């Protein structure tokens, strides 16, 4: 099978078989026929009894494994592990971001740019601000943030925009969030050996300790994020890893922490820094972003993006790349087997991600900007070491249109709305559109890339099919990138490839069909608009019709995003099958069971048209329930 | 192979044979060969790229997962997930416990027994004492032990016993504990796809996330059940499944939260309890314990022990059980088909532990005696459906001493101490055997069964090796229960097994040679004493001649006991071989380079005479060094 759509990606595929490195493609390959255990869920290592493996078909062979598990309570278990690791790598984001947000100062390197935002956060959060110092406002709201994360008595703080009656749901399910470490813990707890050996609690636990993902983790990351950095408006940018020059050093950031990116950015217009770029025979500095770090930065300076999570190699594969700075997450250890055949410094920045034989250089929140600052020379001093004759950057990039924040959608809709009747600065605009099936609804695309799927075909597909339908489609992460590169994020887009009502709906407002909302964590954005048009209509979520879907997921932080959009009422398809087919009894809860407890369920569909019709269907059933 | 050296448990696995039911040693069997890479932990599931499996041989076959991980960053993040499991575990009970102390009360359920543990934990704590309400002492200090969980700014709160030279290695090597279920969070996310890829840093990460156990969660969750249920003193008991009666209502507690069981002991008082159980035609009400929940209640009021974790299961096959009473962890799932062939009762008590098929009674800890008055109930009206053509209970118990806490171990060493010369209340006497020589060293016998190992056989085999050798011995849980039912947890033991000076030492101050020291989170005492003893002679914790074994070790738990206990500086040797021998950099971090870091490291040796020389030559180096 082909290993990716997109051209570029060929291309270098072609040059890495010729320079005789190794990509991801390769090693999947090499793997082979993986694991069946593995792959049903139905393997269990969780004590030094085992390892234990039990049948995935009920019924023949090996029925439990040693302390007696079924292999209902073995999938279960993985399941919830999985969810757990996906909540602490947000949950860690969150509370970087929250401590950045808690050294704060007028004259240091990280201040407060949207004091709006920070005095809307601070009532949300039951901080006072009337004839207040800004930095005192915003130490306040980062000592609450910081307690939702640990907080022993009590109950955490949740975001305005969720519903009151999802709120009563949880509470009656029992799945009400508590602070985001303590339900990690939780969830650890329960899958010791001799603990939970109930599938239907196990699912429950795991689903409560996503929502601290979804509504608190990832909700106050996005949200100091756009107090310190600003929030994103409309921005143009460009996509592909033909953004890299060849007169040029490029620096490439990969990665999710954004405070490090933002500093890399900030030194870059520094004048020493400029004229040694000039000096070791430069035109100057070329800033390239990747995954989510990339949507960070591009999102809120127009940072072009390189590439998506399953392009990173080829990025290096160019011989262009001088220096590869890296903070967490996402981050192939491959990349630095591979930085020995180039010229790039691969530079490891963060004591949580460690990477053998990369260059470690500890990025220093107490001095940020003079951290950034000797990285980014350690890269620009690379520029000396290019080999040109190496030296092969596609000649394919692509525009793209980002920047929808919450706040930026809303003034975006303000246009459409007559002034003699109001209200200005709301979601009601859209509620009127999805109330008058003018549009059908609103779909969510959002993960990463797995070679399992040939790359960002199935997110290309889905987004098609949802807006050919229809159906405006916002996009986060890898998926949002893989639209920008195919060129999705653009306002022409609408009359190329939109139905009638979604294209007159661009027409009206002037917007793409597909907007890019950020990165992972700024899918809590969508919540955040989901909960908006909810609480205008005066319904729970669960009772739109809005979806959310996983082309071609791989990360564990997926699984928790896709469970606690589940928890929170929303429908959620995933284009990868997770490792459950081997327990029937945790396959029926989450497709079919869920559906009762928090008005939604996942649904399986490899196959990108297939979920377009379901989705439409699904959307259609629920359109029909509210009377729209 | 023989499943156990117990002679009870070899007449209970005929009885089940005969009755056809399935133990933990038939699933053990029906797994036959178990997976070679899950075995040496070259197997990753970390995403849904996956399952990667790498050769556990280096050289040959696939290298490296589908991201680039090498066997040896699949090896160490799969054993730092064991210890935050594990961590989880111990920290989920310490956390329960001083939520309980914060609802202490002078006339409700919960009280304070030991008044002068807790003002010497409130001294620990900074909380003032003088001139206050006890129960506003017990609030305080429980607020503070709650803090450690989940602070989020500041340094968290360490015992006194701990050395300073031990906290300032910690510091330097980077390895200094946080708030626990931070720790916990930090873990998970580093072993994210595309974090951490480098063993040495994951080692120390888990390091870092095994001190949170072993000297705040396990530590704080002993002290308050002192504080709340009174420190234990030495005290006689029974031990084996002969405790059982035949003629009365058997109503075994499984697990391990205390609090359940102390109210379950308190209500087997009641009045109308008793007399329902003479009406049900029982002579009365016969409480026996398992594991760490038993290990508990029989410290603190000699209730007797039935057997240890491999013998949960048989404890049903008597017939004889009226009701098993379970609240979370080591609590075997197959017990809930294995109840059906019997009458017996199966009561899940635990919202974090819910069982498939057993029946559940939330334990209520707002009305905790209440609740368990109820819960006993069931278990008493439960007699009147007793078999008993189908009851055998074997005439094998053996009579046990135990009880010795760090407190009452010092009131025993008064004993030696001479009026005239002093001090009273102190380890001097201890320190001083072990620094003449009287004593080599004391070594402390913890861990699990695992049917991997004859049961008991490793635990028994090291601890008459260790005696015999003047090494004294202090043991927890399931190998504390081992010693107890063969016999060793008596005084009379001392002139049958002890060599010469412990022989002395056991009639000076009139104790076993093998001191039961409580439950797993009981291991904290032993740091205690360890510490204690440092800090009276100036020295380091690895500088004397101290040791650790897990002798058949299964769980989780476990694997984080021994990281904490090496970390803290102990050697510590494994009679089962976790799965790191696919990672040549993981075994050798282990047990060859964490000696450079924190001054112990891992020995693993599956014959118990090997370890039992092992360690004698060890501690015989470790005093050379000292000079004694
Ligand atoms: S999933 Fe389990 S059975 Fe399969 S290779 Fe990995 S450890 Fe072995
Ligand atoms: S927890 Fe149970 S099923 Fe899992 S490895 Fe241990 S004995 Fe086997
Ligand atoms: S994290 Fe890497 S090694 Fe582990 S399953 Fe995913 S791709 Fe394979």
């Known amino acids: 099978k082909a290993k990716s759509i997109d051209q570029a990606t060929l291309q270098l595929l ?3 078989k010729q320079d005789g490195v190794e990509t991801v493609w390769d090693r999947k390959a090499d793997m082979k026929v993986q694991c069946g255990f593995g792959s049903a869920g139905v393997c269990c290592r969780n004590c030094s009894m085992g390892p234990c493996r039990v049948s995935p078909v009920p019924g023949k062979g090996v029925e439990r494994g040693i302390c007696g598990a079924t292999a209902d309570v073995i999938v279960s278990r993985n399941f919830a592990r999985m969810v757990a690791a996906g909540t602490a790598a947000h949950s860690d984001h969150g509370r970087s971001i929250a401590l950045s947000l808690y050294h704060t100062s007028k004259d240091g390197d ?39 994360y640990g907080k022993q008595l009590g109950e955490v703080t949740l975001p305005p925009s969720l519903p009151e009656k999802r709120k009563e749901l949880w ?17 650890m707890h329960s899958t010791h050996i001799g603990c939970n050996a109930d599938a239907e609690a196990m699912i429950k636990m795991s689903m409560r300790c996503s ?7 990832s909700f106050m990351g996005t949200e100091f994020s756009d107090i310190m950095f600003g929030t994103p408006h409309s921005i143009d940018t460009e996509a592909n890893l033909g953004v890299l020059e060849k007169n040029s050093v490029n620096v490439v950031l990969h990665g999710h922490e954004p405070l490090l990116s933002e500093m890399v950015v900030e030194a870059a217009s520094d004048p020493e820094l400029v004229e040694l770029a000039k000096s070791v025979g ?4 070329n800033l390239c972003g990747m995954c989510c770090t990339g949507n960070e930065v591009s999102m809120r300076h127009g940072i072009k993006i390189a590439g998506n999570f399953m392009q990173q190699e080829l990025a290096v594969v160019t011989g262009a790349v001088d220096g590869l700075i890296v903070d967490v997450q996402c981050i192939m250890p491959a990349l630095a087997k591979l930085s020995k055949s180039y010229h790039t410094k691969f530079i490891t920045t963060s004591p949580k991600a460690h990477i053998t034989d990369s260059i470690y250089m500890e990025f220093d929140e107490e001095n940020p900007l003079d951290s950034a600052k000797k990285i980014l020379k350690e890269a620009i001093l690379n520029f000396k070491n290019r080999d040109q004759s190496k030296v092969m950057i596609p000649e394919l990039k692509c525009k793209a249109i980002l920047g929808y924040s919450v706040e930026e959608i809303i003034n975006k809709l303000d246009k459409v709305v007559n002034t003699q009747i109001g209200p200005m600065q709301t979601v009601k605009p859209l509620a009127d559109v999805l109330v008058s099936g003018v549009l059908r609804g609103a779909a969510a695309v959002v993960g990463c890339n797995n070679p399992k799927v040939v790359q960002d075909s199935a997110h290309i597909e889905t987004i098609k099919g949802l807006i050919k339908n229809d159906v405006i489609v916002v996009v986060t992460g890898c998926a949002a990138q893989a639209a920008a590169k195919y060129g999705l994020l653009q306002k022409e887009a609408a009359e190329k490839y939109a139905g009638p009502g979604l294209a ?35 319904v729970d979520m669960s009772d739109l019709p809005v979806a959310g879907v996983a082309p071609e997921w791989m990360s ?18 995933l284009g990868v099958a997770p490792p459950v087919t081997g327990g029937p009894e945790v396959v029926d809860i989450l497709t079919n069971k ?6 939604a369920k996942f649904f399986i569909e490899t196959d990108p048209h297939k979920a377009v019709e379901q989705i439409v269907n699904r959307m259609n059933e629920k359109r029909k329930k509210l009377g729209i």
Chains 1, 2 share one sequence.
């Open 594 to 599: 869920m559906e009762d407890w928090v008005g």
């Open 110 to 148: 990280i201040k407060v740019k949207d004091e709006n935002k920070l005095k809307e956060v601070a009532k949300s959060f039951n901080v006072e601000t009337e004839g207040r110092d800004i930095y005192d406002i915003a130490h306040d709201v980062a000592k609450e943030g910081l307690s939702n």
């Open 282 to 285: 430069a035109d100057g500095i």
């Open 171 to 187: 509470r009656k399910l029992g799945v009400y969030p508590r602070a985001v470490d303590r339900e990690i813990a939780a969830v």
């Open 14 to 16: 072609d040059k890495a």
């Open 504 to 538: 007159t709906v661009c027409k009206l407002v002037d917007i793409p069909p597909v907007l890019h909302m950020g990165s992972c964590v700024d899918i809590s954005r969508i919540l955040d608009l989901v909960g908006r048009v909810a609480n205008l209509l005066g």
């Open 556 to 573: 564990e932080k997926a699984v928790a995003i896709g469970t606690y959009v589940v928890t929170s009422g929303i429908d959620t398809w």
């Open 211 to 217: 929502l601290t993902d979804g509504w608190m983790g």
